[PDB]
Design a binder for this molecule. Structure first.
Ligand code: NAG
Ligand code: NAG
Ligand code: NAG
Ligand code: NAG
Lengths: 443, 368, 50, 49
């Protein structure tokens, strides 16, 4: 089979094609072929003409796309072409990679990227990791907000953890005369977390209004999806420091890696089609007036494109067009207007590199395990976290939550309540209580 | 300084040119029209060539015979959205062109089908109905209609009793009808395509689902063609006043475009649109401003009434006619003037032949 | 679903209630034979009663 | 509970005024300032809520 790989604007060199030759794909029975095509126009007419020429002049059935600009119309054009040409098209690393919902029916167009539900789940996991059970929701009248809120509420309801979900706002933002209305409804966000969802242009205005009201400070944290962040190196001088965002893996994912993954997915789909239901391993190419393409019956092939293993990677897609197991990173706005990778999200896991979440009245406390004084239990098997009469307990050696308790723990809780200070308990590693050894203490 | 039009006949293009010329007398801008093509790719290429030939500020799109709205105006909108050139739809109510995420810089001259859900609210308050069921189809249009109806109902703290969905094109809906039969609710609201509506009509009246009580509410696609042929008596359908009319829509579109152009001419820093798709790849840098000017433009008075644009670029304050099928006929029993429904002096019939509105609620006395 | 016979305090109360407000009844026993509590399902983690 | 100073001479810390003002959980505030400063403080408090 012949898969066409199209690159637009600045990209890699022919060396990437080498990875498509010396790989498991060549050794497989699919024996695929690659015809790299480089373009510099990036226009609808140019893209359509190039696709038509490749389909007609060359015998190809799959297309891998990768642009350089951030125009989202490329994804829509690719979806339209796939719906018309009835041929699979994969978009990666550019406007084609941007996730678009509500694709046209009978369109075999796929792209790399997460959905709103996955980002909401990642945000909930991040919140649960640091025990942030009280939060609010702020959104605008932008498509996808309903899905975001519904996913958040469904996750909150079908769980044994104790959440708050105090308030949710709508923030019309459409009526210019109702400018004071946004400020009026913004004075109900006493909860620490906010979990905003809106566009970057509206995000800047909302942040300025909140700063005027006084919702930005040491005691408030904002979590936003990748839509708000937009370009990483284009901070609009208004995002509060410490903002947390969820983004796609753009640093530990090279363009040649994406090209190889797409080629492998196409080859595996072709091999699966050839093995099972061998009536037509691959339909022939076509040209304009594709009405006679019903004989191809791409519906059978479509079901095969959503199941790819690739030596234990689970590259399967979804019926909508987004991959089921993407790679996601958590970024935080540094002091010097920079985004840093704090943690990564596996299939079902979290590898945050910060165990204390660094930012006066916040000090660390050391405790030791004692029979009647400090009992170190384990997390609750039902909800996954401790419960009343228990407090979180770190365990160095990378860490493990323990949720210690006991007489001394109760005394510490009462003292903290009375003096109004926060703490982060953790157990000691070497030394039980303390003794001067060679002039030095321990424990 | 000119505008583009994609009509379905030469007569429509001539009418559009005449309307633009007449509006000119009320600059030297001249109209440009292109006919539809059977192939979507060919249509996109033709629209791109037309755009390259001359700079276009706005593009109007119509529907030819065999509309197939899912792909008739889609290529034009996709091509125009690359440069953020506003596109106005003449006869398109698929409700998929309302989200700005997919279709950018799009405006409507007729309300989408989803807005019909609002029409089924005054009748819910003027007839004292509180228990209803939904037979919405499983697609984008059905989902939008159901969401709008649920949002409207949530205001009064009373949602639908039970919302059921069916896969499009299904030939066996007996299970859903049987499930909904024992629900103590008599008001039935249907939202599906012509073929789906006709299929639902069959295998439904079979189980005495028509007659005493059982108020039926539908939209506009349900009472049409095959579905209308199988529609039972007492169906309360909705009709658009000027939906079919095309010349009036063209006239109002031309007037609104001219008014927006005149308003924008006063403003400075007006970058000209690119003179050709090839080579040019940057945004217009003024498309959002032109779209904003086009929206929120209170037209004085058009042939089809006052022209208002919604926050989503859809028609605002439309007028609907309520039709009640009787003796295989169709008569108007009321007019919904955008905000309220006023009945006429004609009697209203019901599926059971009664002259009084059924209560629409049958409480069950056999408990489990 | 064996059709057994049942009586007692609850049956008498139900009969009196049915006589007071006109309505028929159809009594049946619970399948799992449990009063009901909130539990978690192994798959889909869907919390539900029983 | 607490007392405030609200040094209005230095406007550079204006953003701080809305911050320290969003801490008085007690109902009674017992303000004390001049009429112009009183109006400014009242406007800031109304903005904060
Ligand atoms: C007049 O319309 C024609 C369409 O046939 C177009 O080619 C021409 O450029 C228009 N004239 C001006 C001055 O734009
Ligand atoms: C459409 O509207 C025009 C008004 O401009 C009218 O003359 C014409 O008769 C209408 N056509 C139909 C079929 O109603
Ligand atoms: C619609 O008709 C009702 C009649 O009761 C009237 O009160 C209302 O103002 C009308 N609205 C419009 C937009 O014409
Ligand atoms: C139940 O009994 C009442 C008498 O209190 C009567 O009014 C009602 O009609 C009866 N319902 C029936 C027979 O279904």
């Amino acid at each position: 089979i012949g898969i066409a790989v199209i690159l637009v604007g600045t990209s890699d060199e022919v060396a990437i094609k080498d990875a498509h030759e010396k790989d498991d794909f060549h050794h497989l029975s699919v024996v695929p072929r690659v015809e790299l095509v480089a373009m510099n126009e990036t226009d609808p007419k140019s893209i359509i003409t190039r696709i038509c020429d490749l389909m007609s002049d060359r015998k190809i059935q799959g297309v891998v796309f990768a642009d350089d600009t951030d125009q989202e119309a490329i994804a829509q054009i690719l979806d339209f072409i796939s719906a018309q040409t009835l041929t699979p098209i994969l978009g990666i690393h550019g406007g084609s990679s941007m996730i678009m919902a509500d694709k046209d029916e009978s369109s075999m167009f796929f792209q790399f990227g997460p959905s709103i539900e996955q980002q909401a789940s990642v945000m909930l996991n991040i919140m649960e990791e640091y025990d942030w059970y009280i939060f609010s929701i702020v959104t605008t009248y932008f498509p996808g907000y309903q899905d975001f809120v519904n996913k958040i509420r469904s996750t909150i309801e079908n769980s044994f953890v104790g959440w708050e979900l105090e308030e949710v706002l709508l923030l019309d933002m459409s009526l210019d005369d109702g400018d004071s209305k946004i400020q009026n409804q913004l004075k109900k966000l006493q909860s620490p977390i906010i979990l905003l969802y809106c566009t970057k242009e509206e995000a800047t205005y909302i942040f300025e209004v909140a700063n005027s009201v006084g919702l930005t400070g040491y005691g408030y944290t904002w979590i936003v999806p990748s839509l708000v962040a937009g370009d990483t190196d284009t901070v609009p001088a208004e995002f509060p420091t410490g903002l947390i965002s969820v983004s796609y893996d753009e640093w530990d994912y090279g363009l040649p890696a994406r090209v190889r993954d797409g080629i492998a997915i196409i080859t595996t789909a072709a091999s699966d089609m050839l093995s099972e239901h061998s009536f037509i391993p691959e339909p022939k190419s076509s040209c304009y007036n594709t009405h006679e393409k019903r004989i191809y019956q791409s519906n059978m092939l479509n079901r095969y494109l959503i199941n790819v293993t690739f030596e234990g990677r689970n590259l399967s897609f979804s019926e909508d067009g987004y991959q089921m197991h993407p790679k996601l990173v958590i970024i935080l706005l540094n002091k010097e207007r920079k985004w840093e990778r704090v943690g990564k999200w596996k299939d079902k896991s979290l590898q945050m590199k910060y165990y204390v979440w660094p930012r006066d009245d916040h000090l660390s406390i050391v405790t030791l395990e004692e029979a009647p004084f400090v009992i170190v239990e384990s997390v609750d098997p039902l909800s996954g976290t401790c419960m009343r009469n228990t407090v979180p307990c770190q365990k160095r050696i990378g860490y493990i939550k323990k949720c210690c308790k006991g007489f001394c723990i109760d005394i510490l809780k009462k003292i903290s309540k009375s003096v109004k200070f926060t703490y982060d308990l953790y157990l000691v590693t070497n030394g039980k209580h303390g003794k001067k050894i060679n002039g030095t203490w321990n424990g | 300084v000119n505008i583009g039009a994609v009509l379905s006949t030469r007569k429509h293009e001539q009418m559009f040119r005449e309307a633009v010329n007449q509006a000119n007398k009320r600059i030297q801008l001249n109209a440009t029209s292109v006919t539809h093509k059977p192939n979507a790719i060919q249509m996109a290429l033709s629209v791109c060539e037309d755009l390259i030939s001359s700079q276009v500020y706005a593009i109007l799109v119509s529907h030819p015979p065999t509309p197939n709205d899912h792909f008739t105006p889609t290529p034009v909108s996709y091509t125009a959205g690359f440069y953020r050139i506003p596109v106005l739809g003449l006869t398109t109510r698929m409700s998929i062109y309302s989200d700005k995420s997919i279709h950018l810089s799009f405006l409507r001259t007729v309300p989408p089908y989803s807005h019909q859900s609002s029409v089924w609210f005054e009748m819910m308050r003027v007839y004292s109905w509180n228990h209803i069921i939904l037979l919405v189809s499983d697609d984008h249009e059905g989902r939008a209609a159901q969401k709008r109806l649920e949002t409207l109902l949530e205001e009064r703290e009373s949602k639908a009793e039970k919302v059921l969905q069916f896969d499009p094109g299904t030939k066996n809906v007996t299970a859903l009808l049987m499930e909904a039969k024992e629900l103590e609710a008599r008001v039935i609201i249907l939202s599906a395509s012509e073929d789906d509506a006709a299929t639902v009509y069959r295998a439904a009246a079979m189980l005495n689902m028509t007659g005493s009580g059982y108020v039926w509410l539908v939209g506009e696609r349900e009472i049409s063609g095959n579905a209308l042929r199988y529609a039972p008596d007492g169906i309360l359908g909705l009709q658009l006043i000027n939906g079919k009319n095309e010349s009036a829509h063209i006239s109002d579109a031309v007037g609104v475009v001219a008014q927006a152009v005149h308003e924008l001419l006063e403003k400075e820093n007006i970058t000209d649109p690119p003179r050709g798709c090839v080579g040019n790849t940057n945004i217009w840098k003024t498309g959002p401003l032109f779209k904003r000017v086009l929206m929120s433009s209170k037209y004085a008075d058009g042939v089809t009434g006052r022209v208002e644009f919604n926050e989503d670029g859809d028609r605002k304050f439309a007028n609907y006619s309520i039709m009640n099928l009787q003796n295989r006929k169709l008569v108007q029993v009321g007019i919904y003037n955008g905000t309220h429904v006023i009945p006429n002096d004609r009697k209203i019939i019901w599926p059971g032949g009664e002259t009084e509105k059924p209560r629409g609620y049958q409480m069950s006395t056999r408990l489990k | 679903t064996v059709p057994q016979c049942c009586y007692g305090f609850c049956i008498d109360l139900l009969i009196k209630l049915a006589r007071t407000m006109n309505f028929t009844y159809e009594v049946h026993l619970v399948a799992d034979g449990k009063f009901g509590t909130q539990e978690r399902v192994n798959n889909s983690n869907k919390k539900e009663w029983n």
